Amino acid sequence: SMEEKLKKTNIIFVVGGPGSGKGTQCEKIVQKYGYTHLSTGDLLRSEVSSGSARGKKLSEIMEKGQLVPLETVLDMLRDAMVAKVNTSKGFLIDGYPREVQQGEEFERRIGQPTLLLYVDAGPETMTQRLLKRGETSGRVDDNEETIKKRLETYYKATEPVIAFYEKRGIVRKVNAEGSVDSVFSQVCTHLDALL
Amino acid sequence: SMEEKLKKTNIIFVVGGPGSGKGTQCEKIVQKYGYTHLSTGDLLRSEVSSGSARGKKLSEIMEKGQLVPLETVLDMLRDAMVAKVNTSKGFLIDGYPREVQQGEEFERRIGQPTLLLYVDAGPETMTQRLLKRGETSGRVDDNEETIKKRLETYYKATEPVIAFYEKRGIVRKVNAEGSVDSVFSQVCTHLDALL
Ligand SMILES: Nc1ncnc2c1ncn2[C@@H]1O[C@H](COP(=O)(O)OP(=O)(O)OP(=O)(O)OP(=O)(O)OP(=O)(O)OC[C@H]2O[C@@H](n3cnc4c(N)ncnc43)[C@H](O)[C@@H]2O)[C@@H](O)[C@H]1O
Ligand SMILES: Nc1ncnc2c1ncn2[C@@H]1O[C@H](COP(=O)(O)OP(=O)(O)OP(=O)(O)OP(=O)(O)OP(=O)(O)OC[C@H]2O[C@@H](n3cnc4c(N)ncnc43)[C@H](O)[C@@H]2O)[C@@H](O)[C@H]1O
Ligand SMILES: [Zn+2]
Ligand SMILES: [Zn+2]
Ligand SMILES: [Zn+2]
Ligand SMILES: [Zn+2]
Numbered sequence: 001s002m003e004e005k006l007k008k009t010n011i012i013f014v015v016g017g018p019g020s021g022k023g024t025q026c027e028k029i030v031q032k033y034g035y036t037h038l039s040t041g042d043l044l045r046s047e048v049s050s051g052s053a054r055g056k057k058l059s060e061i062m063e064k065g066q067l068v069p070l071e072t073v074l075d076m077l078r079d080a081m082v083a084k085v086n087t088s089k090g091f092l093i094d095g096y097p098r099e100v101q102q103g104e105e106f107e108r109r110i111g112q113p114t115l116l117l118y119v120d121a122g123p124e125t126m127t128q129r130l131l132k133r134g135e136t137s138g139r140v141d142d143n144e145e146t147i148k149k150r151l152e153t154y155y156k157a158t159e160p161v162i163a164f165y166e167k168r169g170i171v172r173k174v175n176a177e178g179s180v181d182s183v184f185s186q187v188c189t190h191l192d193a194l195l
Numbered sequence: 196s197m198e199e200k201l202k203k204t205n206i207i208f209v210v211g212g213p214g215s216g217k218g219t220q221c222e223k224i225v226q227k228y229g230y231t232h233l234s235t236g237d238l239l240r241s242e243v244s245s246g247s248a249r250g251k252k253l254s255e256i257m258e259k260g261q262l263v264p265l266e267t268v269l270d271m272l273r274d275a276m277v278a279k280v281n282t283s284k285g286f287l288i289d290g291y292p293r294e295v296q297q298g299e300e301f302e303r304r305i306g307q308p309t310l311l312l313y314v315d316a317g318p319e320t321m322t323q324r325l326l327k328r329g330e331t332s333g334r335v336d337d338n339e340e341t342i343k344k345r346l347e348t349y350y351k352a353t354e355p356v357i358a359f360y361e362k363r364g365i366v367r368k369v370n371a372e373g374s375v376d377s378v379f380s381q382v383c384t385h386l387d388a389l390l
């Protein structure tokens with residue numbers, strides 16, 4: 001069954017603040033280790049891109065830097081994992097879970113994480129990186145006021161996810177400040193010790 | 196993509212009361228036409244037989260003749276479709292949807308049905324068939340008190356699904372009383388007109 005396949009595949013939660021460098025690092029991991037990268041923000045923006053009514057309501061939530069309903073995001077995430085599991089070498093789950101309840105529901109419908117990679121950047125680092133992206137990019141959640149909301153939401157809801165999984169011994173932290181290459185070296189040190 | 200694939204495959208919804216003969220007709224369709232038969236009841240009973248805590252809870256609900264939660268049954272159902280869509284000639288969905296809400300979420304995450312085959316029997320015929328099976332079988336829900344509850348749930352929640360899909364012109368009724376062969380001859384007339 002697809003659910004049995006899901007339980008025997010490695011699941012890595014990638015957790016960290018807005019603009020910490022999660023996507024950037026995931027694409028490096030994908031290139032080196034061959035894992036399957038799923039970002040809930042990407043999947044959400046793909047629905048927004050349809051131009052649908054449902055999409056507009058989701059976009060209005062993301063432009064306030066708030067969390068979308070748990071069901072909506074977990075349904076999308078599970079569907080996308082079931083699509084790829086049969087050929088996957090492992091999953092990188094970027095930006096899910098964002099609250100403890102999101103982690104509990106994931107384990108109930110899919111299964112427990114094998115590892116949690118914690119990309120730890122400071123709030124001024126994060127703000128500057130997203131302000132710089134907002135100059136060039138088309139993302140509609142990189143304005144200064146919405147970066148503030150995204151930071152608040154992360155510290156309120158998501159930082160507790162780290163302490164939750166910390167209890168099980170599966171967290172591996174990396175200093176996310178400094179060069180893309182310096183951060184990836186730390187990422188590889190953690191992954192190589194397990195694989 | 197998997198999403199595109201699921202939107203392209205033929206989906207036939209098979210709807211009818213408890214003991215109306217859905218499974219029996221579905222196997223004859225598989226034998227003649229080579230479709231893929233998925234019974235949500237079978238799926239759920241497989242989970243029960245695993246011995247899981249989830250299975251214990253599902254059994255208690257099936258023993259009251261009531262509907263199990265949507266996300267649990269739809270996870271199982273969509274998973275089974277994804278596992279077979281690359282090779283399937285078409286799907287027979289037996290016993291889902293059981294309420295209008297179930298139909299709407301299926302359409303949004305999978306695709307819209309091509310046909311609804313309505314297996315139409317009277318309550319006395321249904322009750323007599325299930326008591327006869329109850330003599331010999333191992334099913335936990337074929338006792339006389341639970342048969343009664345399954346009927347109530349069908350008339351309250353499920354028979355409205357029919358009126359809902361009739362508005363799209365896709366409903367095809369068969370008189371489900373009489374021999375297995377008489378019923379199947381009606382079924383073939385409907386399927387031949389489509390195929
Ligand atoms: N589970 C969920 N539940 C409910 N709602 C959900 C949800 N998931 C998503 N949502 C909703 O969708 C919204 C968007 O979610 P999401 O898309 O997940 O946003 P985020 O994780 O908060 O932030 P980013 O994707 O912007 O940052 P990142 O950490 O991926 O960094 P990146 O590599 O891009 O890097 C950022 C920039 O920095 C640069 N950079 C990266 N590393 C470095 C470096 N070392 N030095 C200099 N620059 C760097 C990059 O080039 C780039 O320009 C949420 O706010 C919410 O509304
Ligand atoms: N979507 C969902 N959402 C929430 N919960 C869900 C759900 N789906 C399932 N559930 C849960 O799971 C439970 C079980 O659901 P489910 O297994 O789907 O039960 P059902 O559809 O109510 O009833 P049966 O499967 O017993 O009848 P059938 O119509 O397939 O007829 P059959 O061919 O077996 O034949 C019956 C008997 O009569 C015989 N027979 C058949 N045709 C004839 C004939 N023409 N003449 C004489 N005998 C015949 C057969 O040999 C057999 O012995 C539900 O009650 C619910 O709790
Ligand atoms: Zn990202
Ligand atoms: Zn990616
Ligand atoms: Zn749902
Ligand atoms: Zn059946």
Ligand SMILES: [Zn+2]
Nearest residue numbers: 221222232233
């Ligand atoms: Zn079958």
